[PDB]
Design a protein around this ligand. Structure first.
Ligand SMILES: [Mg+2]
Ligand SMILES: [Mg+2]
Ligand SMILES: [Mg+2]
Ligand SMILES: [Mg+2]
Ligand SMILES: [Mg+2]
Ligand SMILES: [Mg+2]
Ligand SMILES: [Mg+2]
Ligand SMILES: [Mg+2]
Ligand SMILES: [Mg+2]
Ligand SMILES: [Mg+2]
Ligand SMILES: [Mg+2]
Ligand SMILES: [Mg+2]
Ligand SMILES: [Mg+2]
Ligand SMILES: [Mg+2]
Ligand SMILES: [Mg+2]
Ligand SMILES: [Mg+2]
Ligand SMILES: [Mg+2]
Ligand SMILES: [Mg+2]
Ligand SMILES: [Mg+2]
Ligand SMILES: [Mg+2]
Ligand SMILES: [Mg+2]
Ligand SMILES: [Mg+2]
Ligand SMILES: [Mg+2]
Ligand SMILES: [Mg+2]
Ligand SMILES: [Mg+2]
Ligand SMILES: [Mg+2]
Ligand SMILES: [Mg+2]
Ligand SMILES: [Mg+2]
Ligand SMILES: [Mg+2]
Ligand SMILES: [Mg+2]
Ligand SMILES: [Mg+2]
Ligand SMILES: [Mg+2]
Ligand SMILES: [Mg+2]
Ligand SMILES: [Mg+2]
Ligand SMILES: [Mg+2]
Ligand SMILES: [Mg+2]
Ligand SMILES: [Mg+2]
Ligand SMILES: [Mg+2]
Ligand SMILES: [Mg+2]
Ligand SMILES: [Mg+2]
Ligand SMILES: [Mg+2]
Ligand SMILES: [Mg+2]
Lengths: 68, 114, 155, 97
RNA sequence: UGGGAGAGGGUGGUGGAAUUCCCGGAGUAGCGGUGAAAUGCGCAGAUACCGGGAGGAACGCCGAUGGCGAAGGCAGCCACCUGGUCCACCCGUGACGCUGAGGCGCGAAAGCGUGGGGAGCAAACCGGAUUAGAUACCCGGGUAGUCCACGCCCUAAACGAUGCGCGCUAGGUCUCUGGGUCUCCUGGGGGCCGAAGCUAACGCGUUAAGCGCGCCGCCUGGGGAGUACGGCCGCAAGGC
């Protein structure tokens, strides 16, 4: 179920693309590991950097309560 | 008297405290290992959390409480058992959400935690 | 012991009721291997429990056994720096023994002078839930009940 | 009570009482020193002070050897102390986890 | 000349999580803490819950057997200033190189001066436990300090216990970052396993502890002792 797969061409430096980005967060808000995103080193780093910008902007959350 | 509400479970390694609140968040009643009768470390146990959540839900029902939302904070040994008891209480439990507080590396912990 | 589970000795049923249980209970009356005296006392008791309450020795005794069978008991287990008294179910085999042991033991705490009477009386009392052997049962069961807290600490 | 055996040797009540005095060092630990036994003997190379003592948490069994008897008695006591102290505190060593 | 990666450094901003305290609300008999406890806190209303506020400190997930730096070391995000370094092109200079006694600079923490700042933590210190005792370990408190600016100190298991540069001597697998004709090849890093060889052994092995040249530093039995004396440095502690 690797996330990089379930998407087309997309931008890792694109911090406003909330719809793409939010898929890389666990349901608890955490940036997901490489085992679940399927990114390389290089890409995964830009992923993290832009998710981080995004939360600053209001677009992505910093944390989410876990439901059952 | 209120129909739906909230149940918070504070579960630490030492105890379980359960307080039932109104929809806006204000407590109607609360209970804990101590209230149900234990002192010391026994308060920390799963049987302690059970009696606590029951007594908390029992007290809530006599105020008309019927459905509750369950909020869980802690990783104590009384945690999961505390939830069991709320379900088996006669209360609805529309949800169970864990809102345990964790820092994004904040204040330096006490020494026991390093 | 260390290797495999030991095995319960099958007892030879008693010649006056063919009951594996009377035999056990007899034996627990038996001091010094004087089993003849043991059976005597017992049978004498039954004589009495017929005399004093006009119904079946065997049926009575079996009840007093059923009413002294402790179901939960405590077994000690040091955890950390405290020796916690843990609650445990008692396997029927042990329920039996304790029931018989206690039955005799309470009986031998009685003020009636002759052994044969005391066994009778204790058996009578325990069928009705009275008597020490039932007291021992409950003391044990209350003890387990209080310590319900420590049940998860079980083996 | 206090028992001393002097094997293939003659010893004085003075010496005997001195052994009682030294052994008393063990009373420090405040546990029952039950039927302690001191045995004194003379090998070719020096004396020997053997002792076997039972306490509520175990037995102290030890032996001192030295050119000098008094010194052997002391070396015994050291070993007795060490063991006694191990008995008294070994139980504490595992209160966590 | 064109490109790259990165917690490399400095300045300025700036975000959310948590803790603490204050304010409001609601609520009652305990909370907390340990192996178990006690001190402590709590009917003068604590704990737990909701909303508001104040403040300092550290930046969870990403995060790695990862990366960057000469080392010490460096981690939220943003911009500015700035170093190192690698690649590709094979364009320029024409041995302009290596090392380096002295010197100069940088140098974790603790410590020190002046002034800020102080939520959490916490030497000293108080008290509770544990214990034969317990100037400890564990528990409740707690001041320097931890944080900032500027100036000092100059130590370390400052470690790879491995000085720097160059050349030469099988490969296998993992990884980071470039360039390719992108199966695969070629650089520069970081790990493992190993040819030859080394080595007292343990182990090292193209990141040599192998085979060699250059330069530097250092060792010469253990203690006494990194002490004494002297000298130089330091506000002191103390350093050489
Ligand atoms: Mg507790
Ligand atoms: Mg009895
Ligand atoms: Mg001997
Ligand atoms: Mg308030
Ligand atoms: Mg609040
Ligand atoms: Mg690394
Ligand atoms: Mg050219
Ligand atoms: Mg140089
Ligand atoms: Mg120099
Ligand atoms: Mg420094
Ligand atoms: Mg400092
Ligand atoms: Mg300091
Ligand atoms: Mg000072
Ligand atoms: Mg200062
Ligand atoms: Mg100051
Ligand atoms: Mg003290
Ligand atoms: Mg004391
Ligand atoms: Mg203390
Ligand atoms: Mg402390
Ligand atoms: Mg504190
Ligand atoms: Mg304070
Ligand atoms: Mg000062
Ligand atoms: Mg290291
Ligand atoms: Mg190196
Ligand atoms: Mg050195
Ligand atoms: Mg050496
Ligand atoms: Mg050098
Ligand atoms: Mg050399
Ligand atoms: Mg490559
Ligand atoms: Mg490429
Ligand atoms: Mg490097
Ligand atoms: Mg390589
Ligand atoms: Mg190797
Ligand atoms: Mg070889
Ligand atoms: Mg290699
Ligand atoms: Mg060598
Ligand atoms: Mg010397
Ligand atoms: Mg010498
Ligand atoms: Mg000196
Ligand atoms: Mg020194
Ligand atoms: Mg001097
Ligand atoms: Mg030096």
């Amino acid at each position: 179920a690797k996330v990089k797969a379930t998407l087309g061409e997309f931008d890792l430096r694109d911090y406003r693309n909330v719809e793409v980005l939010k898929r890389f967060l666990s349901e608890t808000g955490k940036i997901l590991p490489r085992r679940r995103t399927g990114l390389s080193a290089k890409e995964q780093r830009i992923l993290a950097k832009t998710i981080k910008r995004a939360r600053i902007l209001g677009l992505l959350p910093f944390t989410e309560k876990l439901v059952r | 008297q209120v129909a739906s509400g909230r149940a918070y479970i504070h579960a630490s390694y030492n105890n379980t405290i359960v307080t039932i609140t109104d929809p806006d968040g204000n407590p109607i009643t609360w209970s804990s290992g101590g209230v149900i009768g234990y002192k010391g470390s026994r308060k920390g146990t799963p049987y302690a959390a059970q009696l606590a959540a029951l007594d908390a839900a029992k007290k809530a029902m006599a105020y008309g409480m019927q459905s509750v939302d369950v909020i869980v904070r802690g990783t104590g040994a009384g945690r999961e058992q505390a939830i069991r008891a709320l379900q088996a209480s006669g209360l609805q439990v529309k949800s169970i959400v864990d809102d345990t507080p964790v820092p994004h590396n904040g204040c330096r912990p006490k020494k026991k935690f390093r | 012991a260390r290797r495999r589970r030991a095995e319960v000795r099958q007892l030879q049923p008693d010649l006056v009721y063919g009951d594996v249980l009377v035999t056990a209970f007899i034996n627990k009356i038996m001091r010094d291997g004087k089993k003849n005296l043991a059976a005597r006392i017992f049978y004498d008791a039954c004589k009495i429990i017929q005399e004093k309450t006009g119904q079946e020795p065997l049926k009575v005794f079996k009840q007093a056994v059923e009413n002294v069978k402790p179901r939960m008991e405590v077994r000690s287990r040091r955890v950390g720096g405290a020796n916690y008294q843990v609650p445990m179910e008692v396997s029927p085999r042990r329920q039996q023994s304790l029931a018989l042991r206690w039955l005799v033991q309470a009986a031998n705490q009685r003020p009636e002078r002759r052994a044969a009477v005391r066994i009778a009386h204790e058996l009578m009392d325990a069928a009705e839930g009275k008597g020490g052997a039932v007291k021992k049962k409950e003391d044990v069961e209350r003890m387990a009940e209080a310590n319900r807290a420590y049940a998860h600490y079980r083996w | 009570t206090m028992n001393i055996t002097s094997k293939q040797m003659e010893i004085t009540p003075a010496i005997r009482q001195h052994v009682a005095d030294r052994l008393a060092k063990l009373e420090k630990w405040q546990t029952h020193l039950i039927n302690p036994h001191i045995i004194l003997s003379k090998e070719p190379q020096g004396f020997v002070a053997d002792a076997t003592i039972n306490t509520p948490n175990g037995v102290l069994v030890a032996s001192g050897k030295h050119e000098d008897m008094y010194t052997a008695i002391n070396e015994l006591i050291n070993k007795l102390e060490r063991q006694l102290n191990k008995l008294q505190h070994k139980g504490e060593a595992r209160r966590a986890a």
